[PDB]
Amino acid sequence: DPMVSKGEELFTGVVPILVELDGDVNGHKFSVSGEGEGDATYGKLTLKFICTTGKLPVPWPTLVTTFLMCFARYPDHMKQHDFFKSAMPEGYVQERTIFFKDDGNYKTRAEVKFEGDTLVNRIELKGIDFKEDGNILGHKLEYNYNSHNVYIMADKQKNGIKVNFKIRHNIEDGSVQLADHYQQNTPIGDGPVLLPDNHYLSYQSALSKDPNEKRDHMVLLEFVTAAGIT
């Protein structure tokens, strides 16, 4: 299927990634740069994020979902349902509202596209209504991350997809801070895209630190595999 081919030839081996984020959460301004590489054959992303403006005013874990669904490993039987690679190289927009239960919300707007050989994720993030002393602005979340499944459905009237899912962030006391994610993606180009049957992506995420890095930063290893169409 030459539409499948177009995605395969773009994603074949290891593809460099650049991420750039501009953020304002309750008027705490910050910027994050990330670099690393994706290997869609294995659903594998390896990334290091640096807060280039100093101390990151929110917990690193709360930005993980915002910081590349095009690197998902779609099994062979599901390749006709991979919207994300089908929109490349021109790319897609990914927008979210992330509601932190009993606290504020993030609103994010991203553009994911090729710039030459490099796959780039340009993000603006606005956080409003956060509590001073709450789990987010008060840095009360643990530096770890749970596995979650993300359910993708077509958003046919918009030629794109929509996704709704819950992330549970462990709080330092043993409890959990729920982050309800609403998401919409639309292609940037005029070209056709693959609109998927309902299915999910299965995420595994591991957070670490560069022992040689003095800046405020996050090392992120993620594995992402499509499933749920047998």
Side-chain angles (χ1 to χ4, degrees):
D1 176 336
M3 169 63 250
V4 172
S5 190
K6 172 159 143 206
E8 290 174 337
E9 295 193 349
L10 277 160
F11 287 88
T12 41
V14 185
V15 169
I17 295 165
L18 185 67
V19 179
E20 298 291 340
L21 179 150
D22 278 330
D24 170 332
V25 170
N26 272 48
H28 305 274
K29 295 178 196 169
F30 60 95
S31 303
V32 179
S33 282
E35 297 188 8
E37 58 192 37
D39 187 353
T41 290
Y42 304 94
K44 182 156 140 163
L45 287 59
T46 295
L47 297 156
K48 182 176 152 186
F49 297 99
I50 295 163
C51 180
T52 63
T53 50
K55 189 144 201 132
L56 183 71
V58 299
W60 282 103
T62 70
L63 293 179
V64 162
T65 51
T66 296
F67 295 140
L68 295 165
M69 290 187 164
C70 51
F71 280 107
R73 188 176 66 78
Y74 275 74
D76 184 89
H77 72 277
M78 289 176 72
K79 284 205 186 179
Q80 262 187 53
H81 306 281
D82 185 343
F83 160 82
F84 311 97
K85 298 182 186 61
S86 76
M88 300 295 167
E90 295 79 5
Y92 55 81
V93 178
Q94 184 158 289
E95 295 152 330
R96 289 220 181 93
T97 302
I98 305 171
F99 297 88
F100 290 88
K101 170 112 183 252
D102 294 326
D103 206 331
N105 70 82
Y106 292 168
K107 291 159 180 177
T108 68
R109 184 185 143 97
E111 291 188 28
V112 185
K113 68 172 129 207
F114 275 90
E115 292 287 2
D117 293 330
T118 303
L119 181 292
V120 172
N121 180 17
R122 295 190 197 210
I123 311 144
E124 297 164 75
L125 172 145
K126 282 304 172 53
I128 64 178
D129 275 282
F130 279 96
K131 289 180 195 177
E132 292 324 311
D133 29 11
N135 300 320
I136 289 98
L137 290 174
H139 295 270
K140 310 191 198 185
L141 302 188
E142 288 185 354
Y143 193 72
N144 53 26
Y145 219 84
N146 308 298
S147 289
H148 302 91
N149 298 146
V150 165
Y151 307 73
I152 303 178
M153 48 211 94
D155 195 2
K156 301 173 139 55
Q157 330 137 187
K158 304 182 183 165
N159 199 28
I161 59 168
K162 52 195 178 175
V163 190
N164 133 308
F165 64 99
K166 296 176 188 37
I167 297 296
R168 302 172 175 84
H169 303 287
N170 297 345
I171 302 165
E172 33 186 351
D173 65 9
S175 193
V176 291
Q177 164 73 64
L178 308 187
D180 269 267
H181 285 63
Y182 283 85
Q183 172 180 349
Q184 221 140 29
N185 297 47
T186 47
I188 290 170
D190 236 9
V193 287
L194 294 165
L195 285 196
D197 288 352
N198 295 349
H199 65 279
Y200 64 94
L201 308 179
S202 298
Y203 273 84
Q204 284 111 251
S205 313
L207 311 198
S208 58
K209 295 284 172 187
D210 182 355
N212 303 308
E213 180 60 64
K214 327 267 225 188
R215 294 169 291 182
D216 198 2
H217 73 286
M218 176 173 60
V219 180
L220 167 67
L221 181 76
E222 266 190 346
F223 293 95
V224 186
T225 312
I229 300 176
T230 73

